[PDB]
């Protein structure tokens, strides 16, 4: 028994889920009217894919 | 102040039959580990008091 033989992998693949729960940036970059700089509007973004 | 919110299809109401002591046993397990809140459930037919 001289050595060992291994079928090396040809390539590499990755699979994460369907990527669907997109964050609502449209509501912040495509809003009809923005707030005044002295009274800026603030929106909390959480539990979504940005 | 609100730092989360979530919704899903309802689970509590899957009652069977109409009358007789109690119809369906609801079983829940709540566990809080490493920030995560884990909720397990099951529903089962039953015909018995106590």
Handedness of CA B22, B39, B6, A39 (dihedral sign): positive
What's the rounded Cα separation, in Å, for the pair B12 and B17? 15
For residues B32 and B15, give the distance between their C-alpha atoms in angstroms, rounded to a whole number: 28
Taking CA atoms, what residue in A is nearest to B3?
A46
* Structure tokens, B30: 């709540």
Contact across the interface for A46 and B4, Cβ inside 8 Å: yes
- Which residues of chain B make contact with A46, given a CB cutoff of 8 A? 3-4
- Resolution of this deposited model, Å: 2.4
> How many Cβ atoms are within 10 Å of A23's Cβ, its own excluded?
13
- The SS3 assignment for A10 reads coil
d(C-alpha B15, C-alpha B29), whole Å:
20
**CA–CA gap between residue B26 and residue B15 (Å, rounded):** 10
Query: Is the Cβ–Cβ distance between B17 and B2 less than 8 Å?
Result: no
Going by C-alpha positions, the residue among B4, B30, B34 that lies closest to residue A45 is B4
Distance CA A49, CA A42 (A): 19
């Amino acid at each position: 028994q001289t050595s060992n033989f291994r079928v090396q992998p040809t390539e590499s693949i990755v699979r994460f889920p369907n990527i669907t729960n997109l964050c609502p940036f449209g509501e912040v970059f495509n809003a009809t009217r923005f707030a005044s700089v002295y009274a800026w509007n603030r929106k909390r973004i959480s539990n979504c894919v940005a | 102040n609100c730092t989360f919110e979530y919704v899903s299809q309802p689970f509590l109401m899957d009652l069977e039959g109409k009358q007789g002591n109690f119809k369906n046993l609801r079983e829940f397990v709540f566990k809080n580990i490493d920030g995560y809140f884990k909720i397990y459930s099951k529903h089962t037919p039953i015909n018995l008091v106590r």
